[PDB]
Amino acid sequence: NNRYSFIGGRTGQWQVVKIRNVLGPGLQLVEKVNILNGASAWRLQGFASNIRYAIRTELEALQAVQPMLNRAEAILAVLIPIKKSAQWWEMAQDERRDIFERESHHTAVGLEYLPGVARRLLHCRDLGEEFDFLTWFEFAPEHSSAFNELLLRMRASKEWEYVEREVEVWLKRL
Amino acid sequence: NNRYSFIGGRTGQWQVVKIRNVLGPGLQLVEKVNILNGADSAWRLQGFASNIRYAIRTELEALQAVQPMLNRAEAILAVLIPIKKSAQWWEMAQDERRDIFERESHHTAVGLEYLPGVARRLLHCRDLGEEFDFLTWFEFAPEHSSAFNELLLRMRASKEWEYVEREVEVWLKRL
Ligand code: HEM
Ligand code: HEM
Ligand SMILES: [F-]
Ligand SMILES: [F-]
């Protein structure tokens, strides 16, 4: 099933460490997040989809180093819902690819954080959700500082001038 | 709301003229199709309107200069064409798919030849878990029927269509 739901509330596989309401309306602090592969204070949902930007040589680079989810060591996670602006979504494909990679170097920068950080990308604009993306990251604690670095590098990029809502939900695996 | 449902059955705004089961399993013949904006009938198809996946800005400019509105008074014929692409297509990277779609197959350039006669809507549905990947919608006056039939055959001859694994044509007339 390609649908995932993230329930913030009193039960789940993940303990909430902190929530940082980076930009726009936040998410209510809760005890735990329950993650369901299918369709409480809030529910987020999104789907796994096909590649939108990455080119073949980028995928090869990613495939050579990216880790799998569910490593025994990867006891920390971060769920980061993201919303991009109307101006982003009205751009053509070349315009969006150019900002994503040529200007902002998204994949190249993220590659610097592999193999330490595992990730999953979910899409949800097309479900009518209040966010556009649910991004998921997991890693061992030794990579927390580097992941915090990466977040600030991304926020400095051209791509991020089109981000209108962002929240960080920091989790620890129970 | 960006979701549309097409329900093949006994009621609706569109009368079925014919169904051509082009490739793979067909769709059951029915009297009418009922189209609902939102989430005795035989099948339901659904999809969502989405953002642009391939077209570049100059292509969008050319499309915007000529593409017609939906619901023109004269556009009494329509065709609903659900399409499924293969697993090999979806595993390709973005550049590989763009190269097939336009550089090799000229999908937008060829389609532009049929505007303004043909109006269109693209719906996506692979991400919903539907049996098809896309629902494509076309509408036009009868004087463009022959040209639309031409266009179909040209697109089926293209490289892109080597990756199409299920296709049905539901021809409709506006009630
Ligand atoms: C950890 C290393 C990272 C790598 C290797 C990486 C890599 C990628 C790649 C390859 C894509 C494009 C997927 C496609 O073509 O469809 C993508 C999309 C995206 N990633 Fe990252 N990323 C990483 C970190 C991050 C971080 C920390 C964030 C959030 C703060 C983030 C947010 C996104 C978003 C929102 C998208 C979708 C962009 C769009 O479709 O407009 N990524 N990432
Ligand atoms: C009538 C003139 C047509 C024009 C101007 C046209 C134009 C386009 C455009 C510009 C796209 C890219 C949209 C995007 O970038 O996301 C698209 C996608 C598509 N069209 Fe056409 N089209 C035409 C006819 C057709 C016909 C007759 C069919 C079916 C037999 C068809 C099937 C599709 C499919 C399945 C997609 C999605 C491709 C994918 O995302 O892999 N189109 N069309
Ligand atoms: F990502
Ligand atoms: F189309």
PDB file of all heavy atoms in Angstrom, chain B residues 97-125:
ATOM      1  N   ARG B  97      12.212   9.797 -18.665  1.00  0.00           N
ATOM      2  CA  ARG B  97      10.812   9.893 -19.061  1.00  0.00           C
ATOM      3  C   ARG B  97      10.504  11.144 -19.887  1.00  0.00           C
ATOM      4  O   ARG B  97       9.811  11.067 -20.889  1.00  0.00           O
ATOM      5  CB  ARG B  97       9.943   9.839 -17.797  1.00  0.00           C
ATOM      6  CG  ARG B  97       9.710   8.411 -17.275  1.00  0.00           C
ATOM      7  CD  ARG B  97       8.792   8.284 -16.017  1.00  0.00           C
ATOM      8  NE  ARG B  97       9.557   8.497 -14.818  1.00  0.00           N
ATOM      9  CZ  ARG B  97       9.654   9.627 -14.135  1.00  0.00           C
ATOM     10  NH1 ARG B  97       8.962  10.720 -14.455  1.00  0.00           N
ATOM     11  NH2 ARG B  97      10.456   9.676 -13.069  1.00  0.00           N
ATOM     12  N   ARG B  98      11.089  12.302 -19.501  1.00  0.00           N
ATOM     13  CA  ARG B  98      10.921  13.494 -20.308  1.00  0.00           C
ATOM     14  C   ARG B  98      11.454  13.286 -21.719  1.00  0.00           C
ATOM     15  O   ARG B  98      10.802  13.695 -22.695  1.00  0.00           O
ATOM     16  CB  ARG B  98      11.597  14.670 -19.624  1.00  0.00           C
ATOM     17  CG  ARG B  98      11.785  15.876 -20.521  1.00  0.00           C
ATOM     18  CD  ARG B  98      10.558  16.608 -21.046  1.00  0.00           C
ATOM     19  NE  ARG B  98      10.901  17.598 -22.057  1.00  0.00           N
ATOM     20  CZ  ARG B  98      10.061  18.512 -22.557  1.00  0.00           C
ATOM     21  NH1 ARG B  98       8.833  18.634 -22.058  1.00  0.00           N
ATOM     22  NH2 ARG B  98      10.465  19.249 -23.599  1.00  0.00           N
ATOM     23  N   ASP B  99      12.597  12.634 -21.843  1.00  0.00           N
ATOM     24  CA  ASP B  99      13.163  12.384 -23.172  1.00  0.00           C
ATOM     25  C   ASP B  99      12.264  11.524 -24.046  1.00  0.00           C
ATOM     26  O   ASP B  99      12.125  11.795 -25.221  1.00  0.00           O
ATOM     27  CB  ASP B  99      14.548  11.782 -23.062  1.00  0.00           C
ATOM     28  CG  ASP B  99      15.562  12.868 -22.631  1.00  0.00           C
ATOM     29  OD1 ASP B  99      15.211  14.111 -22.767  1.00  0.00           O
ATOM     30  OD2 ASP B  99      16.702  12.512 -22.199  1.00  0.00           O
ATOM     31  N   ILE B 100      11.636  10.516 -23.486  1.00  0.00           N
ATOM     32  CA  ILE B 100      10.704   9.723 -24.263  1.00  0.00           C
ATOM     33  C   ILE B 100       9.474  10.528 -24.613  1.00  0.00           C
ATOM     34  O   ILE B 100       8.997  10.480 -25.754  1.00  0.00           O
ATOM     35  CB  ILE B 100      10.353   8.433 -23.502  1.00  0.00           C
ATOM     36  CG1 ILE B 100      11.619   7.551 -23.400  1.00  0.00           C
ATOM     37  CG2 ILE B 100       9.206   7.703 -24.196  1.00  0.00           C
ATOM     38  CD1 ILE B 100      11.520   6.429 -22.395  1.00  0.00           C
ATOM     39  N   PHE B 101       8.903  11.212 -23.613  1.00  0.00           N
ATOM     40  CA  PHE B 101       7.622  11.928 -23.755  1.00  0.00           C
ATOM     41  C   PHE B 101       7.704  12.972 -24.849  1.00  0.00           C
ATOM     42  O   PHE B 101       6.817  13.023 -25.722  1.00  0.00           O
ATOM     43  CB  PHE B 101       7.298  12.574 -22.431  1.00  0.00           C
ATOM     44  CG  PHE B 101       6.019  13.376 -22.435  1.00  0.00           C
ATOM     45  CD1 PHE B 101       4.754  12.757 -22.315  1.00  0.00           C
ATOM     46  CD2 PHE B 101       6.055  14.746 -22.482  1.00  0.00           C
ATOM     47  CE1 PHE B 101       3.609  13.471 -22.324  1.00  0.00           C
ATOM     48  CE2 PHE B 101       4.809  15.459 -22.479  1.00  0.00           C
ATOM     49  CZ  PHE B 101       3.633  14.763 -22.367  1.00  0.00           C
ATOM     50  N   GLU B 102       8.789  13.799 -24.855  1.00  0.00           N
ATOM     51  CA  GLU B 102       8.884  14.895 -25.823  1.00  0.00           C
ATOM     52  C   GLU B 102       9.964  14.734 -26.870  1.00  0.00           C
ATOM     53  O   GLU B 102       9.674  14.861 -28.053  1.00  0.00           O
ATOM     54  CB  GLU B 102       8.938  16.260 -25.147  1.00  0.00           C
ATOM     55  CG  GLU B 102       8.575  17.403 -26.094  1.00  0.00           C
ATOM     56  CD  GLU B 102       7.126  17.390 -26.551  1.00  0.00           C
ATOM     57  OE1 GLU B 102       6.275  16.951 -25.786  1.00  0.00           O
ATOM     58  OE2 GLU B 102       6.845  17.748 -27.745  1.00  0.00           O
ATOM     59  N   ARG B 103      11.190  14.464 -26.469  1.00  0.00           N
ATOM     60  CA  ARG B 103      12.234  14.452 -27.470  1.00  0.00           C
ATOM     61  C   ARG B 103      12.033  13.368 -28.496  1.00  0.00           C
ATOM     62  O   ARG B 103      12.260  13.600 -29.682  1.00  0.00           O
ATOM     63  CB  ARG B 103      13.601  14.300 -26.819  1.00  0.00           C
ATOM     64  CG  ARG B 103      14.759  14.526 -27.868  1.00  0.00           C
ATOM     65  CD  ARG B 103      16.149  14.289 -27.264  1.00  0.00           C
ATOM     66  NE  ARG B 103      16.275  12.868 -26.956  1.00  0.00           N
ATOM     67  CZ  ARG B 103      16.645  11.933 -27.831  1.00  0.00           C
ATOM     68  NH1 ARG B 103      16.942  12.247 -29.093  1.00  0.00           N
ATOM     69  NH2 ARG B 103      16.713  10.670 -27.438  1.00  0.00           N
ATOM     70  N   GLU B 104      11.610  12.182 -28.062  1.00  0.00           N
ATOM     71  CA  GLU B 104      11.353  11.086 -28.953  1.00  0.00           C
ATOM     72  C   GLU B 104       9.938  11.044 -29.476  1.00  0.00           C
ATOM     73  O   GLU B 104       9.742  10.802 -30.675  1.00  0.00           O
ATOM     74  CB  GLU B 104      11.667   9.753 -28.295  1.00  0.00           C
ATOM     75  CG  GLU B 104      13.098   9.469 -28.045  1.00  0.00           C
ATOM     76  CD  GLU B 104      13.281   7.959 -27.885  1.00  0.00           C
ATOM     77  OE1 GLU B 104      13.059   7.167 -28.889  1.00  0.00           O
ATOM     78  OE2 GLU B 104      13.598   7.603 -26.718  1.00  0.00           O
ATOM     79  N   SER B 105       8.959  11.292 -28.640  1.00  0.00           N
ATOM     80  CA  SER B 105       7.588  11.100 -29.041  1.00  0.00           C
ATOM     81  C   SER B 105       6.875  12.375 -29.445  1.00  0.00           C
ATOM     82  O   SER B 105       5.805  12.304 -30.085  1.00  0.00           O
ATOM     83  CB  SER B 105       6.777  10.481 -27.921  1.00  0.00           C
ATOM     84  OG  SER B 105       7.334   9.213 -27.537  1.00  0.00           O
ATOM     85  N   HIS B 106       7.396  13.536 -29.077  1.00  0.00           N
ATOM     86  CA  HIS B 106       6.821  14.822 -29.488  1.00  0.00           C
ATOM     87  C   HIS B 106       5.380  14.927 -29.042  1.00  0.00           C
ATOM     88  O   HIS B 106       4.530  15.508 -29.726  1.00  0.00           O
ATOM     89  CB  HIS B 106       6.937  15.072 -30.977  1.00  0.00           C
ATOM     90  CG  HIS B 106       8.335  14.870 -31.445  1.00  0.00           C
ATOM     91  ND1 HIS B 106       9.341  15.738 -31.108  1.00  0.00           N
ATOM     92  CD2 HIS B 106       8.925  13.845 -32.088  1.00  0.00           C
ATOM     93  CE1 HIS B 106      10.477  15.316 -31.646  1.00  0.00           C
ATOM     94  NE2 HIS B 106      10.257  14.144 -32.193  1.00  0.00           N
ATOM     95  N   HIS B 107       5.087  14.488 -27.824  1.00  0.00           N
ATOM     96  CA  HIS B 107       3.698  14.411 -27.375  1.00  0.00           C
ATOM     97  C   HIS B 107       2.997  15.766 -27.414  1.00  0.00           C
ATOM     98  O   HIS B 107       1.904  15.899 -28.011  1.00  0.00           O
ATOM     99  CB  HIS B 107       3.551  13.861 -25.921  1.00  0.00           C
ATOM    100  CG  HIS B 107       2.161  13.587 -25.455  1.00  0.00           C
ATOM    101  ND1 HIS B 107       1.787  12.378 -24.927  1.00  0.00           N
ATOM    102  CD2 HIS B 107       1.134  14.438 -25.165  1.00  0.00           C
ATOM    103  CE1 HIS B 107       0.577  12.469 -24.392  1.00  0.00           C
ATOM    104  NE2 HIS B 107       0.134  13.703 -24.601  1.00  0.00           N
ATOM    105  N   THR B 108       3.696  16.819 -26.931  1.00  0.00           N
ATOM    106  CA  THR B 108       3.056  18.113 -26.897  1.00  0.00           C
ATOM    107  C   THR B 108       3.011  18.757 -28.280  1.00  0.00           C
ATOM    108  O   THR B 108       1.980  19.341 -28.657  1.00  0.00           O
ATOM    109  CB  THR B 108       3.795  19.030 -25.920  1.00  0.00           C
ATOM    110  OG1 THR B 108       3.669  18.488 -24.584  1.00  0.00           O
ATOM    111  CG2 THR B 108       3.246  20.441 -25.914  1.00  0.00           C
ATOM    112  N   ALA B 109       4.084  18.635 -29.039  1.00  0.00           N
ATOM    113  CA  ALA B 109       4.070  19.194 -30.384  1.00  0.00           C
ATOM    114  C   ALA B 109       2.989  18.584 -31.256  1.00  0.00           C
ATOM    115  O   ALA B 109       2.334  19.294 -32.017  1.00  0.00           O
ATOM    116  CB  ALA B 109       5.467  19.063 -31.016  1.00  0.00           C
ATOM    117  N   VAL B 110       2.842  17.267 -31.208  1.00  0.00           N
ATOM    118  CA  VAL B 110       1.798  16.590 -31.975  1.00  0.00           C
ATOM    119  C   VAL B 110       0.421  16.977 -31.467  1.00  0.00           C
ATOM    120  O   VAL B 110      -0.458  17.366 -32.247  1.00  0.00           O
ATOM    121  CB  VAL B 110       2.026  15.061 -31.937  1.00  0.00           C
ATOM    122  CG1 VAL B 110       0.849  14.275 -32.452  1.00  0.00           C
ATOM    123  CG2 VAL B 110       3.317  14.718 -32.713  1.00  0.00           C
ATOM    124  N   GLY B 111       0.220  16.971 -30.164  1.00  0.00           N
ATOM    125  CA  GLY B 111      -1.077  17.362 -29.667  1.00  0.00           C
ATOM    126  C   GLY B 111      -1.461  18.774 -30.036  1.00  0.00           C
ATOM    127  O   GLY B 111      -2.623  19.039 -30.317  1.00  0.00           O
ATOM    128  N   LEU B 112      -0.499  19.691 -30.041  1.00  0.00           N
ATOM    129  CA  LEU B 112      -0.777  21.085 -30.414  1.00  0.00           C
ATOM    130  C   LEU B 112      -1.407  21.207 -31.794  1.00  0.00           C
ATOM    131  O   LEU B 112      -2.149  22.160 -32.057  1.00  0.00           O
ATOM    132  CB  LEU B 112       0.497  21.914 -30.351  1.00  0.00           C
ATOM    133  CG  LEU B 112       0.731  22.471 -28.967  1.00  0.00           C
ATOM    134  CD1 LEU B 112       2.204  22.939 -28.846  1.00  0.00           C
ATOM    135  CD2 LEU B 112      -0.092  23.654 -28.735  1.00  0.00           C
ATOM    136  N   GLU B 113      -1.128  20.263 -32.694  1.00  0.00           N
ATOM    137  CA  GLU B 113      -1.691  20.312 -34.056  1.00  0.00           C
ATOM    138  C   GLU B 113      -3.192  20.166 -34.058  1.00  0.00           C
ATOM    139  O   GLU B 113      -3.787  20.457 -35.080  1.00  0.00           O
ATOM    140  CB  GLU B 113      -1.040  19.231 -34.936  1.00  0.00           C
ATOM    141  CG  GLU B 113       0.480  19.342 -35.116  1.00  0.00           C
ATOM    142  CD  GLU B 113       0.969  18.182 -35.968  1.00  0.00           C
ATOM    143  OE1 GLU B 113       0.360  17.759 -36.964  1.00  0.00           O
ATOM    144  OE2 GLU B 113       2.050  17.666 -35.664  1.00  0.00           O
ATOM    145  N   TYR B 114      -3.767  19.680 -32.974  1.00  0.00           N
ATOM    146  CA  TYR B 114      -5.183  19.359 -32.891  1.00  0.00           C
ATOM    147  C   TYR B 114      -5.907  20.372 -32.078  1.00  0.00           C
ATOM    148  O   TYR B 114      -7.113  20.207 -31.829  1.00  0.00           O
ATOM    149  CB  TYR B 114      -5.426  17.923 -32.389  1.00  0.00           C
ATOM    150  CG  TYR B 114      -4.817  16.949 -33.371  1.00  0.00           C
ATOM    151  CD1 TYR B 114      -3.460  16.608 -33.308  1.00  0.00           C
ATOM    152  CD2 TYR B 114      -5.557  16.435 -34.421  1.00  0.00           C
ATOM    153  CE1 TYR B 114      -2.860  15.795 -34.269  1.00  0.00           C
ATOM    154  CE2 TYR B 114      -4.973  15.607 -35.360  1.00  0.00           C
ATOM    155  CZ  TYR B 114      -3.621  15.313 -35.315  1.00  0.00           C
ATOM    156  OH  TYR B 114      -3.029  14.461 -36.227  1.00  0.00           O
ATOM    157  N   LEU B 115      -5.223  21.443 -31.668  1.00  0.00           N
ATOM    158  CA  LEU B 115      -5.865  22.547 -30.979  1.00  0.00           C
ATOM    159  C   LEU B 115      -6.056  23.677 -31.980  1.00  0.00           C
ATOM    160  O   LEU B 115      -5.231  23.854 -32.879  1.00  0.00           O
ATOM    161  CB  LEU B 115      -5.012  23.040 -29.829  1.00  0.00           C
ATOM    162  CG  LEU B 115      -5.131  22.263 -28.509  1.00  0.00           C
ATOM    163  CD1 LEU B 115      -5.210  20.760 -28.650  1.00  0.00           C
ATOM    164  CD2 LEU B 115      -4.028  22.663 -27.552  1.00  0.00           C
ATOM    165  N   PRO B 116      -7.129  24.462 -31.852  1.00  0.00           N
ATOM    166  CA  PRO B 116      -8.099  24.537 -30.791  1.00  0.00           C
ATOM    167  C   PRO B 116      -9.269  23.571 -30.877  1.00  0.00           C
ATOM    168  O   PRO B 116     -10.110  23.614 -29.971  1.00  0.00           O
ATOM    169  CB  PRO B 116      -8.570  25.993 -30.857  1.00  0.00           C
ATOM    170  CG  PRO B 116      -8.514  26.305 -32.293  1.00  0.00           C
ATOM    171  CD  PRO B 116      -7.251  25.623 -32.754  1.00  0.00           C
ATOM    172  N   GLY B 117      -9.325  22.743 -31.896  1.00  0.00           N
ATOM    173  CA  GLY B 117     -10.460  21.852 -32.021  1.00  0.00           C
ATOM    174  C   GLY B 117     -10.743  21.017 -30.780  1.00  0.00           C
ATOM    175  O   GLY B 117     -11.880  20.907 -30.307  1.00  0.00           O
ATOM    176  N   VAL B 118      -9.697  20.397 -30.213  1.00  0.00           N
ATOM    177  CA  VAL B 118      -9.830  19.475 -29.074  1.00  0.00           C
ATOM    178  C   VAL B 118      -9.511  20.176 -27.761  1.00  0.00           C
ATOM    179  O   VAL B 118      -8.411  20.717 -27.608  1.00  0.00           O
ATOM    180  CB  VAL B 118      -8.954  18.234 -29.298  1.00  0.00           C
ATOM    181  CG1 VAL B 118      -9.060  17.273 -28.130  1.00  0.00           C
ATOM    182  CG2 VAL B 118      -9.312  17.577 -30.596  1.00  0.00           C
ATOM    183  N   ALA B 119     -10.435  20.138 -26.844  1.00  0.00           N
ATOM    184  CA  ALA B 119     -10.225  20.502 -25.434  1.00  0.00           C
ATOM    185  C   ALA B 119      -9.900  19.259 -24.630  1.00  0.00           C
ATOM    186  O   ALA B 119     -10.356  18.171 -24.974  1.00  0.00           O
ATOM    187  CB  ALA B 119     -11.456  21.178 -24.837  1.00  0.00           C
ATOM    188  N   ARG B 120      -9.183  19.419 -23.528  1.00  0.00           N
ATOM    189  CA  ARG B 120      -8.635  18.307 -22.810  1.00  0.00           C
ATOM    190  C   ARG B 120      -8.565  18.577 -21.327  1.00  0.00           C
ATOM    191  O   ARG B 120      -8.473  19.712 -20.873  1.00  0.00           O
ATOM    192  CB  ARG B 120      -7.277  17.907 -23.394  1.00  0.00           C
ATOM    193  CG  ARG B 120      -6.118  18.745 -22.959  1.00  0.00           C
ATOM    194  CD  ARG B 120      -4.821  18.499 -23.775  1.00  0.00           C
ATOM    195  NE  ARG B 120      -3.745  19.183 -23.098  1.00  0.00           N
ATOM    196  CZ  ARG B 120      -3.602  20.493 -23.072  1.00  0.00           C
ATOM    197  NH1 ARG B 120      -4.274  21.271 -23.906  1.00  0.00           N
ATOM    198  NH2 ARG B 120      -2.678  21.062 -22.329  1.00  0.00           N
ATOM    199  N   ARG B 121      -8.589  17.467 -20.572  1.00  0.00           N
ATOM    200  CA  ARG B 121      -8.216  17.476 -19.164  1.00  0.00           C
ATOM    201  C   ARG B 121      -7.426  16.214 -18.853  1.00  0.00           C
ATOM    202  O   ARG B 121      -7.775  15.123 -19.313  1.00  0.00           O
ATOM    203  CB  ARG B 121      -9.450  17.527 -18.285  1.00  0.00           C
ATOM    204  CG  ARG B 121      -9.196  17.913 -16.842  1.00  0.00           C
ATOM    205  CD  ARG B 121     -10.372  17.554 -15.944  1.00  0.00           C
ATOM    206  NE  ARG B 121     -11.675  18.222 -16.128  1.00  0.00           N
ATOM    207  CZ  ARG B 121     -12.020  19.407 -15.640  1.00  0.00           C
ATOM    208  NH1 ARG B 121     -11.155  20.205 -14.995  1.00  0.00           N
ATOM    209  NH2 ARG B 121     -13.252  19.838 -15.848  1.00  0.00           N
ATOM    210  N   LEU B 122      -6.378  16.349 -18.054  1.00  0.00           N
ATOM    211  CA  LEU B 122      -5.513  15.260 -17.596  1.00  0.00           C
ATOM    212  C   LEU B 122      -5.806  15.030 -16.115  1.00  0.00           C
ATOM    213  O   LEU B 122      -5.638  15.980 -15.322  1.00  0.00           O
ATOM    214  CB  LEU B 122      -4.035  15.632 -17.920  1.00  0.00           C
ATOM    215  CG  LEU B 122      -3.079  14.589 -17.266  1.00  0.00           C
ATOM    216  CD1 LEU B 122      -3.229  13.191 -17.962  1.00  0.00           C
ATOM    217  CD2 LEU B 122      -1.747  15.094 -17.518  1.00  0.00           C
ATOM    218  N   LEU B 123      -6.143  13.812 -15.683  1.00  0.00           N
ATOM    219  CA  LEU B 123      -6.305  13.397 -14.305  1.00  0.00           C
ATOM    220  C   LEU B 123      -5.301  12.294 -14.044  1.00  0.00           C
ATOM    221  O   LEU B 123      -5.041  11.427 -14.881  1.00  0.00           O
ATOM    222  CB  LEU B 123      -7.701  12.956 -13.929  1.00  0.00           C
ATOM    223  CG  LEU B 123      -8.684  14.096 -14.253  1.00  0.00           C
ATOM    224  CD1 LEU B 123     -10.040  13.507 -14.143  1.00  0.00           C
ATOM    225  CD2 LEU B 123      -8.581  15.246 -13.312  1.00  0.00           C
ATOM    226  N   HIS B 124      -4.803  12.284 -12.814  1.00  0.00           N
ATOM    227  CA  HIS B 124      -3.817  11.292 -12.356  1.00  0.00           C
ATOM    228  C   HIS B 124      -4.504  10.366 -11.367  1.00  0.00           C
ATOM    229  O   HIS B 124      -5.198  10.821 -10.471  1.00  0.00           O
ATOM    230  CB  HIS B 124      -2.746  11.957 -11.590  1.00  0.00           C
ATOM    231  CG  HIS B 124      -2.039  12.911 -12.441  1.00  0.00           C
ATOM    232  ND1 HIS B 124      -0.780  12.690 -13.028  1.00  0.00           N
ATOM    233  CD2 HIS B 124      -2.387  14.142 -12.904  1.00  0.00           C
ATOM    234  CE1 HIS B 124      -0.367  13.737 -13.765  1.00  0.00           C
ATOM    235  NE2 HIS B 124      -1.376  14.647 -13.690  1.00  0.00           N
ATOM    236  N   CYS B 125      -4.118   9.115 -11.432  1.00  0.00           N
ATOM    237  CA  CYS B 125      -4.698   8.183 -10.492  1.00  0.00           C
ATOM    238  C   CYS B 125      -3.853   7.004 -10.038  1.00  0.00           C
ATOM    239  O   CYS B 125      -4.300   6.278  -9.136  1.00  0.00           O
ATOM    240  CB  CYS B 125      -6.116   7.715 -10.871  1.00  0.00           C
ATOM    241  SG  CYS B 125      -6.235   6.924 -12.493  1.00  0.00           S
TER     242      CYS B 125
END
